[PDB]
Design a protein around this ligand. Sequence first.
Ligand SMILES: [Mg+2]
Ligand SMILES: [Mg+2]
Ligand SMILES: [Mg+2]
Ligand SMILES: [Mg+2]
Ligand SMILES: [Mg+2]
Ligand SMILES: [Mg+2]
Ligand SMILES: [Mg+2]
Ligand SMILES: [Mg+2]
Ligand SMILES: [Mg+2]
Ligand SMILES: [Mg+2]
Ligand SMILES: [Mg+2]
Ligand SMILES: [Mg+2]
Ligand SMILES: [Mg+2]
Ligand SMILES: [Mg+2]
Ligand SMILES: [Mg+2]
Ligand SMILES: [Mg+2]
Ligand SMILES: [Mg+2]
Ligand SMILES: [Mg+2]
Ligand SMILES: [Mg+2]
Ligand SMILES: [Mg+2]
Ligand SMILES: [Mg+2]
Ligand SMILES: [Mg+2]
Ligand SMILES: [Mg+2]
Ligand SMILES: [Mg+2]
Ligand SMILES: [Mg+2]
Ligand SMILES: [Mg+2]
Ligand SMILES: [Mg+2]
Ligand SMILES: [Mg+2]
Ligand SMILES: [Mg+2]
Ligand SMILES: [Mg+2]
Ligand SMILES: [Mg+2]
Ligand SMILES: [Mg+2]
Ligand SMILES: [Mg+2]
Ligand SMILES: [Mg+2]
Ligand SMILES: [Mg+2]
Ligand SMILES: [Mg+2]
Ligand SMILES: [Mg+2]
Ligand SMILES: [Mg+2]
Ligand SMILES: [Mg+2]
Ligand SMILES: [Mg+2]
Ligand SMILES: [Mg+2]
Ligand SMILES: [Mg+2]
Ligand SMILES: [Mg+2]
Lengths: 179, 78, 126, 136
Amino acid sequence: DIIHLKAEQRTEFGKGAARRIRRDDKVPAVMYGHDHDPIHVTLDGHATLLALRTENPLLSIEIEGQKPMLALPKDVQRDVLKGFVRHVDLLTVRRGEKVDVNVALRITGESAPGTIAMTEFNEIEVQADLLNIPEVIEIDVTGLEAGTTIYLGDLKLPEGTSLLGDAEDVAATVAFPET
Amino acid sequence: ASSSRNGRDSNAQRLGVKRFGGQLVNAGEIIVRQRGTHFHPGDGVGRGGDDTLFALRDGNVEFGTRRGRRVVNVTPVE
Amino acid sequence: ASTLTVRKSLSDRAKARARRQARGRKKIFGTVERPRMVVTRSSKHVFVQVIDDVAGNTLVSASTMEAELREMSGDKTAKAARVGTIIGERAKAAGITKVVFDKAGNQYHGRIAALADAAREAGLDF
Amino acid sequence: MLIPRRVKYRKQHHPKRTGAAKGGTQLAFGDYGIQATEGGYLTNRQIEAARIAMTRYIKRGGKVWINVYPDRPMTKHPAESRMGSGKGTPEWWIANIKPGRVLFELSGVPEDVAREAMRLAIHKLPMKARFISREG
RNA sequence: UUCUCCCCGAAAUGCAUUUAGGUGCAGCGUUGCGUGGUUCUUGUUGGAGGUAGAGCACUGGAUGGUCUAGGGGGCUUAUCGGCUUACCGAAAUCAGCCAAACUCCGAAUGCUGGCAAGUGUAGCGUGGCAGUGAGACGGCGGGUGAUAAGCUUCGUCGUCGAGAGGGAAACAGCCCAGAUCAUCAGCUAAGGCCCCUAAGUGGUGACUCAGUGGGAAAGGAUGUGGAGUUGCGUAGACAACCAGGAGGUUGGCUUGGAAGCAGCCAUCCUUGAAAGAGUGCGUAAUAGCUCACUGGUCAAGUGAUUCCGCGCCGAUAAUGUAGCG
RNA sequence: GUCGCCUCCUAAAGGGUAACGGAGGCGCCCAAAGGUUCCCUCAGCCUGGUUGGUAAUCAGGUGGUGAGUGUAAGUGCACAA
RNA sequence: GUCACUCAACGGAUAAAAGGUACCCCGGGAUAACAGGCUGAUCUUGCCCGAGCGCUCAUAGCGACGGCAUGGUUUGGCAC
RNA sequence: UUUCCGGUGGCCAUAGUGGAAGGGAAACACCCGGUCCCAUUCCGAACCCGGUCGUUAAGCCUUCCAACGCUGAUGGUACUGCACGAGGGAUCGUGUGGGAGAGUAAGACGCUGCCGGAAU
Ligand SMILES: [Mg+2]
Ligand SMILES: [Mg+2]
Ligand SMILES: [Mg+2]
Ligand SMILES: [Mg+2]
Ligand SMILES: [Mg+2]
Ligand SMILES: [Mg+2]
Ligand SMILES: [Mg+2]
Ligand SMILES: [Mg+2]
Ligand SMILES: [Mg+2]
Ligand SMILES: [Mg+2]
Ligand SMILES: [Mg+2]
Ligand SMILES: [Mg+2]
Ligand SMILES: [Mg+2]
Ligand SMILES: [Mg+2]
Ligand SMILES: [Mg+2]
Ligand SMILES: [Mg+2]
Ligand SMILES: [Mg+2]
Ligand SMILES: [Mg+2]
Ligand SMILES: [Mg+2]
Ligand SMILES: [Mg+2]
Ligand SMILES: [Mg+2]
Ligand SMILES: [Mg+2]
Ligand SMILES: [Mg+2]
Ligand SMILES: [Mg+2]
Ligand SMILES: [Mg+2]
Ligand SMILES: [Mg+2]
Ligand SMILES: [Mg+2]
Ligand SMILES: [Mg+2]
Ligand SMILES: [Mg+2]
Ligand SMILES: [Mg+2]
Ligand SMILES: [Mg+2]
Ligand SMILES: [Mg+2]
Ligand SMILES: [Mg+2]
Ligand SMILES: [Mg+2]
Ligand SMILES: [Mg+2]
Ligand SMILES: [Mg+2]
Ligand SMILES: [Mg+2]
Ligand SMILES: [Mg+2]
Ligand SMILES: [Mg+2]
Ligand SMILES: [Mg+2]
Ligand SMILES: [Mg+2]
Ligand SMILES: [Mg+2]
Ligand SMILES: [Mg+2]
């Protein structure tokens, strides 16, 4: 899915300008790529928060003078206590292309009550295609107990989403309870 | 009561650069007092017994790099 | 091409010669008044150049490679002495008078010493 | 009680308690956690009380991570004594907490009882803290 | 320690001291003579750095995971060798961390040169005469101390000291502002404009109803306004009101009793438009009262949840209201 | 308890900066451990090897400073100091 | 030129020196004891959380581990 | 003049580390000897001397590989000079100037001077 965001040129730089923008309830963003100079824009705060609710969404930035262009939020600086987005790094993508992204690991398996599944990572770097971004990568540990551990080289990854990270380290662990 | 096993300290030695970059100096003028060669002697600069870098000639002091060393040179005055 | 560090994977003899050359060069440095005579003593030839280390250029040079000396029958030491005489003559021509000798990581002995004494006889002040 | 095996210097200056959390502002091991919204000093006794509360409420399941460590020693002037005669003897071990620091983490427990355990733990801490999760 | 006025105007620091409330030298004052932009401010241009921050390359500290040398416990039973290693576990490695005496990094300022402009008359040399060498509080950056003191000890700027005038109810150190004298003129600073008390019971838009304003914490609370996110809802929501609110099943370790209510659990199946081995009240122990769920007359919005503004509780000493003067 | 000297931190990236603040050293030593010239590269780790073991001496491989520096600490020093 | 000082209280009062005074005598609140003032560690009085104890039953009544404050009467700190 | 190569500097990893392929005309090198100068805290290993047969296996050289390492913006954030402001208090915020580190896109399998060589 494509999320459309209206942005306009940002020209004032520095902490004072950023504070003024955030008080105006916008959010600064820098959009860069492998073909053109970085573009400094400001986005609507509410729209940016709604768009960034999900992880790795495909955004289209529209500037009135310019043309819509496709980007991904690569680094989102959010406030720590409040959830507000403080700054956005947008990385331009060339429609038909390939990208490296992080997809969230979750556990959807059940074992004996003695052992509890644990995730060794929050995100895994997975090389996928633009139009099919895996929302979540799911691994199921059902009927497996004791001290079995799962590394990154054995996953039921969806089609077109190759693994870019190392496959010689553990990802999921099941072990007896916190004794 | 109690007491401290500390309270001793040595007198201030007043090290550091004495003539900065571009400053005009005379021959023999001390450029930097130091312990060890944080700055090595460059062109027109001699190194003394206590690692003091001083001017071997008149000119302007510059700080630079000679091969892999931080050095202090005295460029002869134009 | 100089890199401070001795290139790794270099042969053991080459590393030893490079280290000795560097430690000699630590105090040897050629100026316009007293340029640096560098003698590279290869297994078959000796190549001598007088260098102004300030500018990084060679003023005069000589070697056994010269056609006037290739067929000059003689031992390695004799050929090195002939090279030393030639380089001294060229230094006199260029008006060098005094030089500083850089053995370039080799012992001052044999061919190197013969070349140095030949230059001294030719009239170089060192 | 968490006490370091050894420290380089037993008598140290008071830790800076200015600024936001330098690092460790995000969950790294567990699913839920406690995030301090205010700075302050966190002693090993308080850490142990909170950990006991969480573990006791979650019973046997789930696992708890203590992200912070009370490795900073605090000296105490000898009692009833006039000022001076050198620094005191270490008496407390604290961790330097800054706003946004994740103190405790929990995993392997349903969200509601995890929240209740975190509430029990937070009521033992000397600074304000909140329950956080990986957005569920 | 006794008359006057005119000009300038400190110090309470450093070093040393049989010294610490003394004194010498230097610092700071004044003054004669001499030297004249050398001082200073700003801009520009160039230097050395390791603080703040940050980081984990080093040295220490540290959490979890993987893995493991090697130690512990056992047996077959041991000289081995094996099963174990379901225990311990250096190291290595992955991820998150910590540091006044850690640094792969690294500012702002400050310091110090060149140049340019601006500038009071600043700077410097050398003589005469000093006083001072008990400091105080405030801002900022630190040590001591308990996250203490109107505490103590440094760095730095300010005021006071040695400073009147305006403001702070009063109130050396805070804010405004440096008093040559006269004036029954005007404009302002901080702070103020209902009355005390000079000037607005000013205009417009919101919020508060606590006399909050006009002291306070952890914590607690259908206070009240505003901004979201989200579930359900004229397939008819939430309340209110009439019928089904139960079989098998007194489910099991308990406990003369756990039958639905001592505590702990697999957290099922059924006559069926409908229900939980079971949530409150009742109860020696079962009974029962009553709810989610199912019809219906009515039905237009409800139910969560987050954040923001102002409020509430917590709140609590002694002569007299007495924490807006 | 302290008094002179040296190193670090406090000390706020020049210098300087106090407390009965936090850590340690000094009142020597060396005729070479001084001068000069030339030569050399360590510690650790891995493998093999009489006595011999974690570790003596030897071999190969790896390894740039983590060894070393008469003596504290810092600044230095592998170009080696 | 060089020598002789733990003149170490190390800018080194004499080459040469310990005590008692409640029998005592002759500036300082620059500095202690008492009271006042500040502070509140300690003390004191509350409060939040509720492990647990209370046949059963957290809260009849109790309150572990921790947390937050009141009072200024305790011991102190400060030395106004 | 150009190309290739040997020496000798400069920048001191954008150059290193590791992997792959290929090359020697001069040159470099390994290599072959130890009689001679000389040498080993033993050893002609090294140093030195005498040769240039043999050999491109290695050094060296050329091409390729971002793989480890290295280099690295823009924007934002931390901090901060000056000027203020807010909390009972730890402490926090704003104006006006300066502004990182980390991380991100990316760069990069070196650059450059002089001398000599063989060919053109
Ligand atoms: Mg010397
Ligand atoms: Mg000396
Ligand atoms: Mg990090
Ligand atoms: Mg005056
Ligand atoms: Mg810091
Ligand atoms: Mg004086
Ligand atoms: Mg005095
Ligand atoms: Mg004084
Ligand atoms: Mg004083
Ligand atoms: Mg003072
Ligand atoms: Mg002050
Ligand atoms: Mg302090
Ligand atoms: Mg005071
Ligand atoms: Mg006075
Ligand atoms: Mg004044
Ligand atoms: Mg006044
Ligand atoms: Mg007044
Ligand atoms: Mg008044
Ligand atoms: Mg007026
Ligand atoms: Mg005004
Ligand atoms: Mg009045
Ligand atoms: Mg009105
Ligand atoms: Mg009005
Ligand atoms: Mg009230
Ligand atoms: Mg009130
Ligand atoms: Mg309140
Ligand atoms: Mg008033
Ligand atoms: Mg300093
Ligand atoms: Mg400073
Ligand atoms: Mg002082
Ligand atoms: Mg003295
Ligand atoms: Mg005497
Ligand atoms: Mg008597
Ligand atoms: Mg008297
Ligand atoms: Mg007094
Ligand atoms: Mg007094
Ligand atoms: Mg008193
Ligand atoms: Mg009184
Ligand atoms: Mg008292
Ligand atoms: Mg006192
Ligand atoms: Mg005082
Ligand atoms: Mg970078
Ligand atoms: Mg950067």
